[PDB]
Design a protein around this nucleic acid. Structure first.
Ligand SMILES: Nc1ncnc2c1ncn2[C@@H]1O[C@H](COS(=O)(=O)NC(=O)[C@@H](N)CO)[C@@H](O)[C@H]1O
Ligand SMILES: Nc1ncnc2c1ncn2[C@@H]1O[C@H](COS(=O)(=O)NC(=O)[C@@H](N)CO)[C@@H](O)[C@H]1O
Ligand SMILES: [Pt+2]
Ligand SMILES: [Pt+2]
Ligand SMILES: [Pt+2]
Ligand SMILES: [Pt+2]
Ligand SMILES: [Pt+2]
Ligand SMILES: [Pt+2]
Ligand SMILES: [Pt+2]
Ligand SMILES: [Pt+2]
Ligand SMILES: [Pt+2]
Ligand SMILES: [Pt+2]
Ligand SMILES: [Pt+2]
Ligand SMILES: [Pt+2]
Ligand SMILES: [Pt+2]
Ligand SMILES: [Pt+2]
Ligand SMILES: [Pt+2]
Ligand SMILES: [Pt+2]
Ligand SMILES: [Pt+2]
Ligand SMILES: [Pt+2]
Ligand SMILES: [Pt+2]
Ligand SMILES: [Pt+2]
Ligand SMILES: [Pt+2]
Ligand SMILES: [Pt+2]
Ligand SMILES: [Pt+2]
Ligand SMILES: [Pt+2]
Ligand SMILES: [Pt+2]
Ligand SMILES: [Pt+2]
Ligand SMILES: [Zn+2]
Ligand SMILES: [Zn+2]
Lengths: 527, 527
RNA sequence: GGGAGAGGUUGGCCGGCUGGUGCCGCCCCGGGACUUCAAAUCCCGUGGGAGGUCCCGCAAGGGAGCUCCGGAGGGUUCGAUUCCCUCCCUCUCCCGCC
RNA sequence: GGGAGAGGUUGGCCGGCUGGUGCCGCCCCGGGACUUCAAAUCCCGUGGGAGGUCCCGCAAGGGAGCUCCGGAGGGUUCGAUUCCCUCCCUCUCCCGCC
């Protein structure tokens, strides 16, 4: 892919000028610039920058400057500015007050067939033209900030990526085919065929909440949840010696950005905006509310105006605060490993659609284990964790498989292929549990993931600038257990009649709850 | 306050007309309308509507119609429309195609001195003029929807309220002076003077999280939190027989509206917007992200565009899902009372300011008790709950007071004075705990509220349309314990050295955690 | 089960009429006139539902008035109870099924 | 502690000069010329820091080149090492404090 730049540069002189007196100097400069300055740094076989033309108006000198990857037009402009202004200053007592790039054009010549639909959306350009297997990108009024931040450079990288069809996902990193079953519990005799959501709605173990994806869990359901969770903490989390933590469920949009998670699933998160400072805006709002007496376009639009820009996301990962914890810190193997868990609250995923599954919800509860160590140690914690969980699933008499996770959570986007970092051969494993009411065991939709076990390699260690004293390689990982999910699976397999639930569960129910609590019936509702 | 309406009404005839042929009919109608129709329903001593003038253009008949509270101009317009169109239809073969109110004016004559600053912001009017102790409100282009919804009526109510200076808060409902101490634990000998936030930051029992108002709680802190919470659940919640529930922490803006809570604290909540459906918007976004390589005005603004209108608030009350549960349901005393609690997760309050207190945070943990019963029973649950809590505070060897709560949470706004409903003499009580490091016990800022105990009267029962079979009066109430707060108070009083903590706490720490966990130190951080 | 026919109000699963904002008969209810009483006779209808507004009452509640409803929604028209379209529903017939 | 004075580089807490994009002397480093060797002598300076770009190398890393830095920030000017303002900091003096 040949790549060629052309810029319209404008040098604004300190005062008006009579060009005829100036040109002699510009001509001389330009000629010697093309010969020397704009060939400097260019490798022997290649082309640099040339000032292709110039002209002098009363305020300005206008230049056509062309470039190559070896020397780019604005870098050229930089080399020219300071110099041509010293000459102008010495010869004519005139400087260059400002320098601007009204038009900056880049042409990418392809061997591949290209058309608009191949390219797609091009983020920063004012024009995109595709012709003759060529992409002409034009940028108006280019800031020094764009240039410093290599914004155009990345646009180019993008357009290349978009044309080369790299977007087809077998192109992705994981070494082992997802779906691949590492481990299996053979089938248990099949004890319950009932539909957990429908049955739970029936008996009112959940009542549907007004918001999409959400539910109210009434006491029998909640008692199950409590002990199920407590039993998980006892058998796995606490047994493997993870120490407790309280992590924020409200996560700064910038933490999301550092993780690259924002790049990955921007459409699967909820966004959160806080209120503006000025208390009178809300005095006024309160007034609009009273007068309209409802939420409508007017009041709801007026609400938006009193809000700030979105600065947070309701936490989907559930492990984020941990990288903020280690951020910019330096570790010693005597301080390693670090193993924390958090069971504080609800974790959110926005899925659009019929939200009607109890097995897939927007608001869920999970135990998040999180850890950092040298990578041999790093991968063992995940192994132990898996073995730990397998044993629990057995104690809960559940049918389960462990398979290679289909996609990395923090990998769920692509062009991040831009960096370079050390990654595990198998980033993510899923602990799946069979739900009989969904179909025969062969069917992948009859299994839900009740937990994911991930080694991250160096990914977050890098973005959060976590280092080791020596400089040893550091790895992180997280595992988490959707307890909401484990509950559904327990019901799906063992059914709703409590005396047929697993032993450790009955005991927990009885001791803490004195029997399985009953639905808070009304006359109308439970039905 | 005398009140007088004048409307410019426009009746649009089905076809163009030659007025001279029409006027004879309009004149006749108008004269008889003023005599009969527009005096109907008006009480004997009072004024109705009059059509003060009319004129006929080629498409339209224009009318000046004036009114009083007894008969308002548009009601007049309604009485006129159907009738004048039957006559026009019979005499001229012409109907009234549409009817509009381009200008609708209301004048409120006051005896009180009024100026603009008294009135303040007037929500729906296109003009407000104050002169000669008079407020002229003008509405352009008035929809039938405004009229149906009595929007203007409430504007008037408002402007009256705003002038009558009712806004000064001694005007508020609570019978007993807030601050009033119902009950007290005499001073304990004073065992620790240290500053809990500063000390905790020092030893790294919390690390500061990037977002305003938030923190990471590391294992010793979290272990304390876990057992403290578990001990509360054992001694109060579970002892008084509250049954467990899982309540949504993400609350629909409409639930907020029904509670009247939105009217109350619109500036103390976080707002949440979900993403738009179209997945390509995010394809595009992902692209803008890569190219800019940062969150900035451009990308952050572009993010806003892919978001929907705010439809939720991060739950500040912590009891909201319960009214959604009972909503539109009918209860039987055999089903009463209903007592649930929820310990699911974080509850949010946006306070703007230096967020540096551990005693006042944006993201906190509390146990929420919630209940419904006949009101004698209703108030007992709160009493029991208080007695329950007092005993716990004693077992935790804390200095505590119970005082009349300064403001109702769901009362935190005003003009809701519009309705009529049965309210307790003392809506809210606070359980306050002494923090030595803040000042001498006399100082109210040295006490924080570790819980609030509220009977709501009929307030939510009404707005959520919860009824009883018989029709007996129903009450609700909630209590909640900020466990975050209880932790700070424990430290504030007993200090950071674990062997000097209360007995039931040590035991809980040892059994579950095998000693008090240690800080996950790095080389740099804990410091 | 498939098909065709008849119908559907605002006291009446009453009958009839009507492109003029609904009318006629009969009955029921309520009220009124006539009057020894009774019955007979005659007049009135703001007779059901739904939602606002205003007045009265501490309250339970009472009164005034207005708009909308003709199975439900939509069309035509100046005007639809009336004509046309869609669905709903009752009632009889044919066909097939035992 | 208060006050006043002197100063502050991009090899040198070296000295001097300079409104022309920095220069002079001396020393140090590196490189080069002259040459029996040594020393002497002469020339060169892209000699420190910071950040991009390009090339090379599997890599550790190597090379080319460009922009910015004269205590830190800002002003004037066509041009600031030089002049002016603000803060920082070193060095001496006076005053007061023992
Ligand atoms: N929508 C959902 N409904 C219920 N549980 C869910 C949902 N999304 C995630 N979970 C639970 O959370 C676990 C982790 O989700 S994950 O995307 O696969 N992996 C992660 O988030 C990792 N960061 C570990 O927390 C799942 O295995 C499941 O147990
Ligand atoms: N910003 C905060 N930081 C810490 N705890 C808080 C905060 N806001 C509220 N709480 C806790 O939550 C309790 C209840 O808050 S409240 O406004 O007073 N009352 C309510 O919210 C009631 N609906 C009961 O939940 C407080 O007493 C305190 O224990
Ligand atoms: Pt090339
Ligand atoms: Pt020159
Ligand atoms: Pt071009
Ligand atoms: Pt520039
Ligand atoms: Pt560039
Ligand atoms: Pt640049
Ligand atoms: Pt891809
Ligand atoms: Pt079943
Ligand atoms: Pt309201
Ligand atoms: Pt390794
Ligand atoms: Pt238990
Ligand atoms: Pt009922
Ligand atoms: Pt009046
Ligand atoms: Pt007429
Ligand atoms: Pt007026
Ligand atoms: Pt209208
Ligand atoms: Pt009105
Ligand atoms: Pt209306
Ligand atoms: Pt008020
Ligand atoms: Pt102290
Ligand atoms: Pt990126
Ligand atoms: Pt009562
Ligand atoms: Pt325990
Ligand atoms: Pt260190
Ligand atoms: Pt009205
Ligand atoms: Pt460059
Ligand atoms: Zn995670
Ligand atoms: Zn509450």
């Amino acid at each position: 892919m040949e790549l060629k730049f052309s810029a319209e540069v404008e040098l604004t002189l300190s005062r008006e000028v009579d060009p005829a007196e100036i040109e002699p100097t510009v001509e001389e400069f330009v000629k010697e610039a093309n010969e020397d300055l704009l060939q400097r740094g260019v490798p022997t076989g290649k082309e640099g920058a040339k000032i292709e033309s110039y002209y002098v108006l009363y305020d300005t000198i206008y230049m056509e400057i062309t470039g190559t990857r070896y020397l780019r037009p604005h870098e050229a402009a930089m080399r020219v500015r300071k110099r041509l202004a010293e000459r102008l200053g010495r010869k004519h007592r005139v400087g260059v007050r400002d320098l601007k790039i009204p038009r900056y054009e880049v042409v990418l010549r392809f061997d591949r067939e290209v058309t608009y639909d191949y390219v797609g959306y091009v983020p920063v350009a004012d024009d995109v033209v595709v012709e003759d297997g060529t992409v002409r990108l034009t940028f108006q009024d280019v800031d020094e900030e764009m240039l410093r931040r290599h914004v155009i450079d990345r646009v180019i990288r993008l357009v290349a990526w978009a044309v080369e069809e790299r977007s087809e996902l077998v192109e992705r990193v994981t070494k082992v085919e997802p779906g691949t079953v590492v481990d299996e519990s053979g089938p248990r005799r099949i004890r319950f065929r009932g539909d957990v959501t429908e049955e739970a709605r029936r008996r009112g173990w959940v009542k549907e909440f007004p918001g999409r994806g959400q539910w109210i869990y009434t006491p029998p359901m909640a008692a199950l949840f409590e002990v199920l969770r407590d039993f998980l903490l006892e058998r796995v989390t606490r047994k493997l010696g993870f120490e407790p933590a309280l992590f924020p469920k409200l996560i700064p949009l910038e933490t999301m950005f550092r993780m690259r998670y924002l790049h990955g699933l921007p459409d699967g998160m909820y966004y959160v905006c806080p209120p503006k400072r000025d208390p009178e805006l809300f005095d006024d709002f309160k007034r609009e509310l009273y007068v309209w007496g409802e939420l409508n376009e007017r009041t709801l639009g007026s609400l938006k105006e009193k809000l700030r820009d979105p600065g947070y996301v309701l936490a989907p990962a559930q492990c984020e605060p941990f990288y903020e914890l280690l951020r910019d810190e330096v570790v010693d193997p005597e301080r390693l490993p670090i193993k924390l868990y958090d069971c504080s609250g609800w974790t959110y995923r926005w899925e659009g659609g019929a939200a009607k599954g109890l097995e897939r919800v927007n608001e869920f509860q999970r135990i998040e284990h999180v850890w950092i160590a040298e990578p041999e140690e790093a991968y063992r914690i995940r192994r132990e964790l898996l073995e730990a969980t397998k044993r629990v699933a057995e104690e809960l008499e559940l049918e389960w498989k462990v398979v290679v996770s289909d996609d990395p959570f923090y990998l769920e986007g692509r062009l991040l292929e831009d960096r370079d970092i050390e990654l595990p051969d198998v980033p993510s494993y899923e602990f799946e549990v069979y739900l009989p009411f969904k179909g025969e065991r062969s069917s992948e939709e009859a299994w839900i993931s009740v937990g994911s076990f991930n080694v991250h390699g160096e990914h977050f260690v890098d973005g959060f600038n976590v280092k080791e004293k020596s400089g040893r390689t550091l790895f992180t990982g997280c595992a988490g257990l959707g307890v909401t999910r484990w509950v559904v699976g327990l019901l799906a397999q063992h059914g709703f009649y409590p005396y047929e639930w697993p032993e450790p569960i009955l005991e927990r129910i009885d001791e803490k709850f004195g029997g399985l609590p009953e639905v808070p019936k009304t006359l109308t509702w439970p039905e």
